[PDB]
Design a protein around this motif. Structure first.
Motif, PDB file in Angstrom:
ATOM      1  N   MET A   1     -45.007  -6.226 -12.626  1.00 18.82           N
ATOM      2  CA  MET A   1     -45.073  -4.779 -12.748  1.00 18.82           C
ATOM      3  C   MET A   1     -43.681  -4.167 -12.709  1.00 18.82           C
ATOM      4  SD  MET A   1     -46.970  -2.509 -13.506  1.00 18.82           S
ATOM      5  CE  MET A   1     -48.446  -3.521 -13.538  1.00 18.82           C
ATOM      6  N   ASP A   2     -43.467  -3.156 -13.562  1.00 23.79           N
ATOM      7  CA  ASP A   2     -42.214  -2.406 -13.544  1.00 23.79           C
ATOM      8  C   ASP A   2     -42.381  -1.115 -12.753  1.00 23.79           C
ATOM      9  OD1 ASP A   2     -39.394  -2.397 -14.822  1.00 23.79           O
ATOM     10  OD2 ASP A   2     -40.193  -0.411 -15.279  1.00 23.79           O
ATOM     11  N   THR A   3     -42.437  -1.247 -11.435  1.00 25.86           N
ATOM     12  CA  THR A   3     -43.329  -0.512 -10.536  1.00 25.86           C
ATOM     13  C   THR A   3     -43.049   0.985 -10.478  1.00 25.86           C
ATOM     14  OG1 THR A   3     -41.823  -1.119  -8.775  1.00 25.86           O
ATOM     15  CG2 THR A   3     -43.483  -2.666  -9.466  1.00 25.86           C
ATOM     16  N   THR A   4     -41.969   1.419  -9.852  1.00 20.80           N
ATOM     17  CA  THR A   4     -41.773   2.838  -9.619  1.00 20.80           C
ATOM     18  C   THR A   4     -40.306   3.160  -9.826  1.00 20.80           C
ATOM     19  OG1 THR A   4     -43.612   2.901  -8.046  1.00 20.80           O
ATOM     20  CG2 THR A   4     -42.043   4.712  -7.953  1.00 20.80           C
TER      21      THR A   4
ATOM     22  N   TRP B   1     -50.326   3.653 -14.574  1.00 20.23           N
ATOM     23  CA  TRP B   1     -50.548   2.658 -13.535  1.00 20.23           C
ATOM     24  C   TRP B   1     -51.986   2.675 -13.063  1.00 20.23           C
ATOM     25  CZ3 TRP B   1     -46.707   6.075 -13.882  1.00 20.23           C
ATOM     26  CH2 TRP B   1     -45.455   5.547 -14.191  1.00 20.23           C
TER      27      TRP B   1
ATOM     28  N   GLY C   1     -53.799  -0.866 -13.470  1.00 18.42           N
ATOM     29  CA  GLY C   1     -53.174  -1.803 -12.553  1.00 18.42           C
ATOM     30  C   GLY C   1     -53.348  -3.292 -12.785  1.00 18.42           C
TER      31      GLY C   1
ATOM     32  N   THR D   1     -50.979  -5.497 -12.148  1.00 18.45           N
ATOM     33  CA  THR D   1     -50.677  -5.566 -10.729  1.00 18.45           C
ATOM     34  C   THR D   1     -50.365  -4.142 -10.294  1.00 18.45           C
ATOM     35  OG1 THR D   1     -48.413  -6.271 -11.261  1.00 18.45           O
ATOM     36  CG2 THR D   1     -49.976  -7.984 -10.580  1.00 18.45           C
ATOM     37  N   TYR D   2     -50.020  -3.964  -9.039  1.00 14.89           N
ATOM     38  CA  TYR D   2     -49.905  -2.582  -8.593  1.00 14.89           C
ATOM     39  C   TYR D   2     -48.441  -2.175  -8.417  1.00 14.89           C
ATOM     40  CZ  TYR D   2     -54.918  -2.240  -8.098  1.00 14.89           C
ATOM     41  OH  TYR D   2     -56.264  -2.188  -8.369  1.00 14.89           O
ATOM     42  N   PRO D   3     -48.109  -0.888  -8.651  1.00 11.88           N
ATOM     43  CA  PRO D   3     -46.690  -0.496  -8.749  1.00 11.88           C
ATOM     44  C   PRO D   3     -45.976  -0.294  -7.409  1.00 11.88           C
ATOM     45  CG  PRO D   3     -48.108   1.361  -9.262  1.00 11.88           C
ATOM     46  CD  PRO D   3     -49.007   0.185  -9.127  1.00 11.88           C
ATOM     47  N   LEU D   4     -45.492  -1.394  -6.806  1.00 14.86           N
ATOM     48  CA  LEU D   4     -44.563  -1.272  -5.679  1.00 14.86           C
ATOM     49  C   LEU D   4     -43.398  -2.268  -5.661  1.00 14.86           C
ATOM     50  CD1 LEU D   4     -43.958  -1.993  -2.241  1.00 14.86           C
ATOM     51  CD2 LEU D   4     -43.925   0.338  -3.162  1.00 14.86           C
TER      52      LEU D   4
ATOM     53  N   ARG E   1     -40.859  -3.581  -7.084  1.00 15.39           N
ATOM     54  CA  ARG E   1     -39.428  -3.449  -7.315  1.00 15.39           C
ATOM     55  C   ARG E   1     -38.778  -2.522  -6.299  1.00 15.39           C
ATOM     56  NH1 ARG E   1     -34.952  -2.647  -7.119  1.00 15.39           N
ATOM     57  NH2 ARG E   1     -35.333  -4.487  -5.809  1.00 15.39           N
TER      58      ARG E   1
ATOM     59  N   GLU F   1     -38.838   1.850  -4.519  1.00 14.29           N
ATOM     60  CA  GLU F   1     -39.499   3.125  -4.296  1.00 14.29           C
ATOM     61  C   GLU F   1     -38.547   4.306  -4.433  1.00 14.29           C
ATOM     62  OE1 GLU F   1     -38.808   0.874  -2.016  1.00 14.29           O
ATOM     63  OE2 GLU F   1     -37.949   1.843  -0.251  1.00 14.29           O
TER      64      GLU F   1
END
Lengths: 59, 111, 176, 82, 79
Positions: free
Chosen positions: E15-18, E37, E40, E42-45, E47, E49
């Motif tokens: 994921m290229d999260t946030t 997102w 999901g 996977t879920y965005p975290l 990398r 915040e």
RNA sequence: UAUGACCUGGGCUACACACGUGCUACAAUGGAUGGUACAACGAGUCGCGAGACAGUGAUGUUUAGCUAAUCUCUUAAAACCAUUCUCAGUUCGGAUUGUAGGCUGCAACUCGCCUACAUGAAGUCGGAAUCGCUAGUAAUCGCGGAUCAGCACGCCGCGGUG
């Protein structure tokens, strides 16, 4: 030189930082037993004779 | 970020994995080994999931690693010509203890 | 994308502040990137450069092609040759698949003093850039970066306006 | 350090030239000098033993002694070094 | 596009999260993946915040490097 | 009236470079984990200087004891088990440095340190060769004097292992 190097440290200088002690025959530099107030080299000149309870034959 | 995310090794503790890093070491990297509660950790090939997220600004107490570079730089490059009795010897290259440079200190001194 | 909309609607004021008002369909606008090794260095084996082509396929703009030098340098004896340093030559909405790296990932990862490049005056509204290493693009870069073989980064506006180009990139993401 | 150390007679020239005039050299002696923040902006001499060195001061000159004001440790120097 | 891109855009299941702000497609990294997102892969975290202000030239302006500079090299009362 | 001196700091120790020159390393017997048990160990209630202590330590904060077959020294290290780094320019290897502090003394660069810390270069077992080593002998580990306000790997002796 014998008096700027015997008499000078007899004259009161600043401190022990300045007037380092030695024997009073010849103002020889350090390697001086300040625990016995005399130079090694000059006290050796006595140790021709020796007045010490140390064993004399160079232990 | 990234500071703690920079160039992960495996197999180690985080303390050697931060003396490994330019800077934070045996006072402070053990201090934040405990402050993030790490304690050897890793020898794992996994740091954590979120003690990273603690150790972002928990690690970020050193100001800074790039300003350790600019702290040597910002320090001495102002500290060039106070004398320059020390700066000339430091940057010409001899270890400026006031050190006896007759023969030895051969590598930094330069053969 | 996302910066299409914030681009146009955020430059509608900068339309009027900068050069052209009322050319509401055709205002200044970005063009493309080029991302190259360009190292030279091919004379050793060219094969280490042929892992730099997997560095360019690794950064994954497009197909990592290469260029032939016009004359082959006597000081480099390379006999013109096609491997020299990689080529993309990436443009368009793929740039708009590429810029959020530049503005919210890439240099905010490498943290090197906001990457000032005010020297980059290309005469007419274009703007160069380079890089030494790339610890950029997570879970793609690592385990082969024992030496990043380099990359170069040149943005280009449709406009010939250098300072409005400075406001066009530096509109979003990267101060200089 | 705790229990600081400082000049005396050219401390009385810090206090004899800070008030009066920031100009002249001194037949100095100091392995025992400092620099105060008030001291910056004047000229003082450095006793090598022949050349009372006329150096003005900048704020960079933090409170060292005149044994290390300027490198008057005479060593020539530009012949065969490094 | 090429037809059938035998170069990259290959989908690593990540994921290229946030504040890289990307999701997943035929895509491989960074600014490329998708924009959502709310399903999901996977879920965005994983990398980060904190945003581009994660760059410490501006992180609440990043004046936490201050104080430095004038205690270099003397504001002291020794000697 | 000068190669005789008083003062003052800078030289005396400075460095392109060879040999004199020991320790430290390169490593798993190391390096951290701990708690040992030892000869020494001499100056001293002039001075050494507690389990009284801020401590990262210099040193204070107390100096208890201390005219020594009292006392602080004098509780030295390896062998001890505990964990890992069991392999690599290595929890390295400690070149500096920048400091940030203390001790000494009137003052720590010339022309003492020490305590941090951060970065931690060489260095992965050593040409030609040399020298030493047939007993507690090499090797090895400590103690004191030694000089001395400060300041000693090699600097005297003694022994701990072997």
């Amino acid at each position: 030189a014998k008096k700027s190097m015997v008499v000078k440290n007899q004259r009161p200088a600043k401190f022990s930082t300045q007037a380092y002690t030695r024997c009073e025959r010849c103002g020889r530099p350090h390697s001086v037993y300040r625990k016995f107030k005399l130079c090694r080299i000059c006290l050796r000149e006595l140790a021709y004779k020796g007045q010490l309870p140390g064993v004399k034959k160079a232990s | 970020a990234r500071f703690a995310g920079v160039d992960i090794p495996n197999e180690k503790r985080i303390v050697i994995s931060l003396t490994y890093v330019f800077g934070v070491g045996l006072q402070t990297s053990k201090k934040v080994l405990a402050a993030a509660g790490v304690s050897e950790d890793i020898r794992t090939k996994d740091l954590t999931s979120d003690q990273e997220d603690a150790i972002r600004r928990e690690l970020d107490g050193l100001k800074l690693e790039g300003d350790l570079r600019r702290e040597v730089s910002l320090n001495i490059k102002r500290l060039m010509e106070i004398g320059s009795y020390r700066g000339m010897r430091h940057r010409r290259g001899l270890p400026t203890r006031g050190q006896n440079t007759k023969n030895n200190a051969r590598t930094r001194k330069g053969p | 994308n996302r910066l299409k909309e914030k681009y146009t609607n955020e430059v509608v004021p900068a339309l009027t502040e900068q050069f052209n008002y009322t050319s509401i369909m055709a205002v200044p606008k970005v063009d493309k990137i080029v991302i190259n090794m360009g190292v030279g260095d091919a004379v050793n084996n060219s094969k280490n450069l042929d892992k730099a082509v997997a560095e360019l396929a690794l950064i994954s703009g497009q197909k990592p092609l290469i260029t032939k030098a016009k004359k082959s340098v006597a000081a480099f004896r390379l006999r013109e040759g096609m491997p020299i340093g990689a080529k993309v030559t990436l443009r368009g909405e793929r740039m708009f698949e590429f810029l959020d790296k530049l503005v919210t990932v890439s240099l905010p990862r490498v943290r090197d003093f906001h990457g000032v490049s005010n020297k980059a005056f290309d005469g007419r509204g274009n703007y160069t850039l380079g890089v030494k290493e790339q610890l950029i693009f997570p879970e793609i870069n690592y385990d082969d970066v024992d030496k990043v073989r380099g990359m170069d980064i040149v943005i280009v506006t449709t406009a010939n306006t250098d300072e409005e180009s400075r406001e066009l990139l530096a509109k979003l993401g990267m101060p200089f | 350090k705790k229990g600081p150390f400082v000049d005396e007679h050219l401390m009385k020239k810090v206090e004899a030239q800070t008030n009066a005039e920031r100009k002249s050299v001194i037949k100095t002696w100091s392995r025992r000098s400092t620099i105060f923040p008030n001291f910056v902006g004047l000229t003082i001499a450095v006793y090598d033993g022949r050349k009372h060195v006329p150096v003005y001061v900048q704020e960079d000159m933090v409170g060292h002694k005149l044994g290390e004001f300027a490198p008057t440790r005479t060593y020539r120097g530009h012949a065969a070094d490094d | 596009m090429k037809q059938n891109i035998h170069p990259n855009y290959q989908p690593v299941v990540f994921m290229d999260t946030t504040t890289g702000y990307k999701f997943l497609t035929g895509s491989t990294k960074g600014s490329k993946e998708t924009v959502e997102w709310e399903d999901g892969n996977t879920y965005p975290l994983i990398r980060v915040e904190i945003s581009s202000d994660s760059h410490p030239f501006y992180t609440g302006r990043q004046k936490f490097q201050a104080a430095d500079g004038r205690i270099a090299r003397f504001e002291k009362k020794y000697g």
